[PDB]
Symmetry: D2
């Protein structure tokens, strides 16, 4: 039900081998680790969770943009890119979180479908 | 070698049934019709051209954003979104032109891969 | 009534010295030159037109992004970024056309105000 | 030395009355409140800090986008837009953090200048 897609606006390419960490907000308002991985050669990270586990709640997707840019020898602005949202059962069932990265900027969108 | 992907930033969805026209710049500097279609239920338009036909040159991809927004009952700013680029044989072989649409704004990127 | 602002997403800076050409669609459906200029050290281009001259019409703002990137040593994807819109069709408005540039991407927005 | 600018991509306008909270990472690795305010009728938030107070550190600018959209009748995707960055680590700089908002998307950039 959750996929993350990361693109590079400098090179016009997928952003490959980017670390992504997903957290779920706990009852005490802290962020508990939920899922993680590294983007593939297509800039995608699949397999993070299952329908059973991905219950309604507040989630944070953290994309390690700084390390990505540093590996390319480029000085970036942000420590990371953060996407924070509520999963809602009454909306469509599949969430794609997409991010388009530049050294001093990023764009993010959600594509939520059935 | 050419795919167009259109997303809706208001609804968080693919932008479905959007008209897309591709033109190739002619020797006399006019834009000659090249390919066209309507985005699918996934916001994608595949099958526009072939490797044989998609020779090096300057291309324009015109996305009919105004009609899209009007069909949703939303007043938009732009007449259309235009993406103009050179196809180059020495770069990667497959071009995805992606657009992320809002009523008064849009984002576009190119994902060029082998 | 028409201002253009250009930012560089690689440098985190205004995009300075960017050429901008504005056209207006004529009665015969061709794109007539309307005005032109270059962005300043703030990434802004002011003074393109006047409220008298900026009548209703369909306008195209062409931002010459390719030349900008090439001069930074980047061979960019796009030839230019074009922004096409109807202006002043409910009376005079002020338009800011903003663009944020990367070598293989850009975003553009408009801020439209009624004086 | 720190300004926040917020634009609305649906309306083509400044995003007015947007709450913004700035935090700074403390020695113990927690996010300490640093400053806060709301965007003006221009979509800008000035006066958050001073060059004396805005020392080197890791800062988080939280833009309360959800509340903004809900008040326009749109149930948006994100809880907020957060911008996290190291500041002033090569001496004082001026930072503009800009955000362009849609219900299911945003973009953000920084403009960093050396006075
Ligand atoms: C211009 C743009 C494209 C995308 C985009 N998301 C995509 C997903 C699959 C294939 C191509 C894609 O392009 C995402 C964002 C946040 C953007 O600002
Ligand atoms: C297209 C765009 C414009 C801006 C923008 N930032 C601006 C600052 C002052 C005036 C107009 C401005 O437009 C910011 C972002 C994150 C964008 O994606």
């Amino acid at each position: 039900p959750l996929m993350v897609k990361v693109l590079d606006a400098v090179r016009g390419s997928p952003a490959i081998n980017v670390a992504v960490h997903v957290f779920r907000k706990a009852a005490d308002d802290t962020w508990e680790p939920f899922a993680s991985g590294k983007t593939s050669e297509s800039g995608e990270l699949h397999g993070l969770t299952t329908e059973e586990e991905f219950v309604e709640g507040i989630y944070k997707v953290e994309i390690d943009t700084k390390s990505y840019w540093k590996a390319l020898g480029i000085s970036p602005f942000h420590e990371h890119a953060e996407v924070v949202f509520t999963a809602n059962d009454s909306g469509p069932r599949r969430y794609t979180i997409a991010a388009l990265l530049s050294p001093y900027s990023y764009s993010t969108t959600a594509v939520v479908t059935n």
